[PDB]
Amino acid sequence: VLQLTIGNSTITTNSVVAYGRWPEFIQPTEPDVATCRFYTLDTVMWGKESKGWWWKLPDALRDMGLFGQNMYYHYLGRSGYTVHVQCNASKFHQGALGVFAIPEYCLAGDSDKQRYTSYANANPGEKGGKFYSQFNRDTAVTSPKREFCPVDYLLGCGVLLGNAFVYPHQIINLRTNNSATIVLPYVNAMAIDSMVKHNNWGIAILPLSPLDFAQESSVEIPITVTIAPMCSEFNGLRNVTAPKFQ
Amino acid sequence: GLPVLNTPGSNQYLTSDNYQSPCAIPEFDVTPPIDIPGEVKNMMELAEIDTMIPLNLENTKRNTMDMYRVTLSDSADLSQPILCFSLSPASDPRLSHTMLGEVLNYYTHWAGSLKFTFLFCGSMMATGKILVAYAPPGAQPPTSRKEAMLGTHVIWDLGLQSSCTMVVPWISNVTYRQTTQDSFTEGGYISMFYQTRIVVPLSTPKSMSMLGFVSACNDFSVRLLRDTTHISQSA
Amino acid sequence: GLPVLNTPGSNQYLTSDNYQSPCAIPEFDVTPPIDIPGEVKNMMELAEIDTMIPLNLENT
Amino acid sequence: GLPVLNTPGSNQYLTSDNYQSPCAIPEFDVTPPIDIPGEVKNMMELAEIDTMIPLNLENT
Amino acid sequence: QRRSRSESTIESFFARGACVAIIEVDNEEPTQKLFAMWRITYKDTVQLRRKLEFFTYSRFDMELTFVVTANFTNTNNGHALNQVYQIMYIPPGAPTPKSWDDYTWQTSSNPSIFYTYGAAPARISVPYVGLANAYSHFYDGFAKVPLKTDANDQIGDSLYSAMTVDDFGVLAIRVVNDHNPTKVTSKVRIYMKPKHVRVWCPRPPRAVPYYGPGVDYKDNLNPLSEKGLTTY
Amino acid sequence: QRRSRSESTIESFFARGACVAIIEVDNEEPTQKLFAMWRITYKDTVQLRRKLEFFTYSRFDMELTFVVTANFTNTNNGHALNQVYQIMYIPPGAPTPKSWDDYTWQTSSNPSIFYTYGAAPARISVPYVGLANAYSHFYDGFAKVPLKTDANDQIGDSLYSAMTVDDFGVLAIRVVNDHNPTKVTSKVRIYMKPKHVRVWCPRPPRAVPYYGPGVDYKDNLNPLSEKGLTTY
Ligand SMILES: CCCCCCCCCCCCC/C=C/[C@H](O)[C@H](N)CO
Ligand SMILES: CCCCCCCCCCCCC/C=C/[C@H](O)[C@H](N)CO
């Protein structure tokens, strides 16, 4: 059994390295301990009719630990991630979770106006978001929601979810593995970029096969996403950034 | 000065050419490249990546999540195949839109051994044997397991391994098949049958789904770049 | 740049010429040739083959 | 003479180019340069010079 | 012996560029001749065909030269600026244009030429794009086989001596200029010069006029003329 | 194995020049089409876009080729001498022209082409002019961040997946010839051939028609067609 320990956080179990590149550094400010903890996101229930979940990195780790504090205080920071998606399932639970790590995971909005989604709805953080079977158009012209309308089979970006495996992916197949680990290096056009506005990665937990258990009516098991910022180094220390999330 | 002779083909613009051109912005200090992960040096490197196949394409399951997973069960008939599709990675509706097929639609000729990784998404207590058979063309499609086991085939135990790699070797009369659907360069027929039905104990979902991922091998290559039929632009 | 002089015969197309031309499909991995029997390297090789003559050519 | 092929972009004038051109006044004995002070070899040498900023920009 | 076989070589025998097609392209109003897609093949003309049917298999780096000749039609006093003709390749599978103002003319991956009228004819070389190891001038088979288990006879019904329906795609020629009231009818003549020709399994040439893209023949089956048996 | 990957290379995959824009420029009288400023981007056409959206980041030395096709409009018998088209670059910040007879057309530091109609299409190479170390086909962020201390929501309101408003400036095309009574409507088609292409972080291509310059989509969300589960 694999037991990976980083900083002051240990996770017991296969792990895959995104694009075969390990997170490594490039005077940046690198907390070797305060930012290497495996911050645990909000656990999400995998309902029988669930369509999927999506988080934005490092947006997900904006309020957890000192990583978010260094991210808001500093101007521009680069950080690799280690995403451990653990789904406790019994021998009689069937299902598969595609854990995709989309670089620059641009999602589609609900309104007819292109790229009209707001910053608050595009950066939900630890909460994340969820996919939808169809594309429900925003009809509130007086007060547009300005939120994503991610579609499962379209991956929220118009591409096919079947081809989404071009990204760094890992399949949590409850019959063979109850957890998955993806080590994402800092992927960006720039050597280092502002994290408060830019989301380096996007994690998508999509049920490739529906969850069933003993022919039960409704079955829901927990899914815990634990993200660890690896080699997170920031630069441009200045006054704290307090974004408007409404 | 030097006596020259304008040959036929002058003052034309061939979109596919490597002629030099004046730099519009000379002495331009470009941004130095950094070591960005995931560098792609060839398009086939994307085809080698196994990507899930829209196997099921019924009128009610296509263009949804149901199209990627194929439902197999113990109640399912063993005489009838699980799934079947021609080995047309660029013109078959199931393989055409896969990343492999997406890259092939930009080329006219393709030649290589394919790779179909079928992943089982049933319970760990669910066991069974699936016969995955590739039958080269030129004969009746394998409508039965007795006909499918005559060609290339592999038995996949659902209990031992959750994913089976059915490698389709490159067998063809022509050195390169066409990406369109045509009977001369047709690829073959991939089918799945129940060698032994799925056996599930009590308190176990009798009907389970599975996934299929198509990929290209190292020997896979393409040529005669072209425009994909997928994308369109109303004008 | 280099001063050139367009000689007579420019911008013409002589069907019998060996001028170069841009490859319409560059970096094209052609199919490697195999040893097919009966390779003809010259047209006269076909003339050397004895072929029956329509000697009789009456109207019937 | 030499068979040439006019590539796309011929008979155009791109303002940003380094093509040669016929000297309109050939064999012209230009005036030899002298060591004039303050030679600028790069535009950024002018940016490096600290110049006062119009900080205050009120309407008055 | 002492006389060289230079002019008789296969490279020299096909060194001439042969008109393989004449494509009529108009800039008329939307009243179908706006563009034209010609299936690339030498069998539209009989001369280069017969030169190629001399052999069973061929492998040559083709060289296509487009000579565009335009005229004013339905107008005695007609005006129009110098037209630019787009000759786009649509290999088997690439989306074919359904109209003049179609997206496929963008040529994002389809190779295309933009020939300015009055300039030198548009020449381009094409390597051996054959699927097999040699071009099959003659095919003694089919593309499908009608099996006993076929639901109907049309499932396996294929054309004899026809390998692929879309042999090598279509050449789509249009006038890039907008549709002007003055109709300019243009004829693009495509001349095919096989280069680096390697031929295999020679065949006697067709003595009767061609009939279609196969070896069929309908009439004019009298190649030899009347001549005495003992008349020199 | 033995078959080469030459045609599959990234340099070969983008070796084709793709129409990225069609600019309509007229020489009409001052009655707005005298000149036209097109924001330089490949997202006006979907083919080259989709080819680029195959990857997240790119670094390529572009090659733009302008094919100008002119016609006589509103005149059956129209005359005009050979026109010269000025294609001027206006990078982000350079003053844009407000009229045809504007000073900015002097091109003292803006690179510009003067293409004589009927000549070879105007080709020019452009290096990687990206600010970052690679072009960002996809951006999962914004340009501004709405802060708690902002006076209003529009201070930090920015478009999603939009880095800069003036991405890479505008291409301003005009007819250098004086406005003649005979109106000559011209279409300048810009063809983009990425050279020295280096791509990073591949992405699956868009299976649904594009909708705007982002990854949004409105209709035609049915890429796959109906097909039996066990039908070959
Ligand atoms: C402006 C771009 C035009 C590109 C033109 C290249 C098209 C390549 C097709 C050439 C193939 C013709 C030679 C092959 C002939 C075949 O053997 C016969 N049709 C019978 O098999
Ligand atoms: C006649 C002078 C014309 C000079 C033309 C040079 C303009 C340079 C702009 C080329 C940049 C286009 C390639 C970049 C594409 C971007 O990545 C996408 N718009 C999204 O980021």
Residue numbers in the entry:
A (entry chain 0): 82 to 94, 99 to 111, 121 to 340
B (entry chain 3): 1 to 235
C (entry chain 3), D (entry chain 3): 1 to 60
E (entry chain 1), F (entry chain 1): 66 to 96, 100 to 300
Can I see the authors' text?
Poliovirus (PV), belonging to the Enterovirus genus of the Picornaviridae family, is the causative agent of poliomyelitis, an acute infectious disease that can cause paralysis, mainly in young children. PV has a positive-sense, single-stranded RNA genome encapsidated within a non-enveloped ~30 nm icosahedral protein capsid. The D-antigen elicits protective immune responses but can be converted to the C-antigenic form, for example by heating.
A total of 9,630 ‘best’ particles from 1,465 micrographs were subjected to three-dimensional (3D) reconstruction, yielding a structure to an overall resolution of 3.0 Å, as judged by a Fourier shell correlation (FSC) cut-off of 0.143. The MVA PV3 SC8 capsid was clearly in the D-antigenic conformation due to the absence of openings usually seen in the expanded state12 and the overall particle diameter of ~300 Å. The hydrophobic pocket of the VP1 capsid protein subunit was in the open state and unambiguous cryo-EM density was observed for a long-chain fatty acid molecule of ~18 carbon length bound within, which likely corresponds to the sphingosine observed bound in the native virus. This would appear to correlate with the observed stability of this variant. The thermostability of PV3 SC8 was compared with PV3 IPV. The PV3 SC8 VLP shows significantly improved D-antigenic thermostability, maintaining 50% D-antigenicity at temperatures exceeding 60 °C. In contrast the genetically stabilised PV3 SC8 VLP was produced with high levels of D-Ag, very little C-Ag, had enhanced D-antigenic thermostability compared to IPV, and induced a neutralising antibody immune response at least as good as that from the current IPV vaccine. In contrast in the MVA expressed PV3 SC8 VLP, the pocket factor is observed at high occupancy, suggesting that the mammalian cell environment is beneficial for the synthesis of authentic particles like those produced by WPV infection of its host cells.
